[PDB]
């Protein structure tokens, strides 16, 4: 039945509710566009034949083709929009710059969309008030104390604390730092909040 090639797109995303992003399927998308083109050509041919021959009993088959086209459009558009939702989540989890391992799954146009979104969102935050606004993507949990103790999980480069002062994030080194500087590195998975 005419729906089946489109359902591959839908059924993939439905199987994974965790928000994680699968690889962009190209051949299924092309196949749906080709299928719709074929159905359109057949319907146009029968329409002009019915109109020129003066023959009425073709009308039910014409309606039959018409609704099939709209079903195919709904399946493909519904598939694209969900990927946009999964992409938007990566800005608010993780951070401003994505890891290359994860960018491998996005299409070119998806990268265009993501960069536009970052530019606009950064413009909004900068305008909130005072000078240079407020980064509302932080303070995700209600605050209990000024300072926290953190343990490094990965060998990482130099980390700047204030002006020229910096610390070296070698694995299993341990530091006592103010909470507001560590918060994003803990979220990305570089550091561990002990005790």
């Amino acid at each position: 039945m005419f729906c089946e090639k489109a359902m591959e797109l839908i059924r993939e995303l439905h199987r994974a509710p965790e928000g994680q992003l699968p690889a962009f399927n190209e051949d299924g998308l092309r196949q749906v566009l080709e299928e719709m083109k074929a159905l359109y050509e057949q319907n146009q041919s029968d329409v002009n034949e019915a109109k020129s021959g003066g023959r009425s009993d073709l009308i039910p088959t014409i309606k039959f083709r018409h609704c099939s086209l709209l079903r195919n459009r709904r399946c493909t558009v519904a598939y694209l929009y969900d990927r946009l939702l999964r992409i938007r989540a990566l800005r608010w989890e993780y951070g401003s710059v994505l890891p290359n391992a994860l960018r491998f799954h996005m299409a070119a146009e998806e990268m265009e969309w993501f960069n536009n979104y970052k530019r606009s969102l950064a413009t909004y935050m900068r305008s909130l008030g005072g000078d240079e606004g407020l980064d509302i993507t932080q303070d995700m949990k209600p605050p209990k104390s000024l300072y926290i103790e953190v343990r490094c999980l990965k060998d990482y480069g130099e980390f700047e604390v204030d002006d020229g002062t910096s610390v070296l994030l070698k694995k299993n080194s341990q530091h006592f730092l103010p909470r507001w500087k560590c918060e994003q590195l803990i979220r990305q998975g570089v550091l561990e909040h002990i005790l």
Binding site: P60, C67, D82, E93, I186
Partner: protein
């Protein structure tokens, strides 16, 4: 991640909802009322099975192209069985979206609408207490025996109950203040 919600219980499906897209794929039995060419032809009177989306598309209120009938599980023989004790029946071996699909058959203006509505409402009220007690009270155990028979709509309520339980137990045992990584824990 703002998943688009299902519309099924209302007067329309949500256009972009994945669940409504899957649910509307289900097959429905019909009778053909006018002969159809180039499908060779299908003669008038032929009995068929075809998807719900297509049946709604072709059903003009004149009933000029086709006429529709209820599947067995929504007819009187089965409604009588649900009425005995609704806790025992397996609404996952029935169609996985029982209430959602059942609510959309009222569109076709059958004389049995008044009975279908009462069937669905009474089934829901009958099943409610078990979902409440079992979701709220099962802590750090194998739930697979409990969630086995639940419809897709009912499963959402089970998950919400479990989530609410877990949060309080974290808070009481002092684990709630720690900062941690989100869904990127995959990597």
């Amino acid at each position: 991640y703002f998943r688009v919600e299902s519309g099924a219980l209302g007067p329309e499906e949500n256009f972009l909802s994945l669940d409504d897209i899957l649910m509307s794929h289900e097959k429905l039995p019909v009778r053909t009322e006018t002969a159809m060419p180039r499908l060779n032809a299908v003669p008038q009177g032929s009995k068929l099975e075809l998807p719900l989306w297509l049946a709604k598309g072709l059903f003009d209120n004149k009933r000029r192209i086709l006429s529709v009938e209820l599947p067995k599980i929504y007819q009187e023989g089965w409604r009588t069985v649900f009425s005995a004790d609704p806790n025992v029946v397996d609404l996952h071996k029935m169609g996985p979206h029982f209430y959602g699909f059942g609510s959309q058959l009222l569109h076709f203006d059958s004389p049995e609408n008044a009975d279908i509505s009462q069937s669905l409402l009474q089934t829901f009220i009958g099943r409610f207490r078990r979902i409440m007690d079992s979701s709220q009270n099962a802590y750090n155990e194998d739930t697979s025996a409990l969630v086995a028979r639940l419809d897709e709509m009912e499963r959402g309520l089970f998950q919400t109950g479990q989530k609410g339980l877990n949060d309080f137990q974290c808070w009481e045992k002092g684990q709630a203040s720690q900062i941690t990584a989100s869904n990127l824990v995959q990597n």
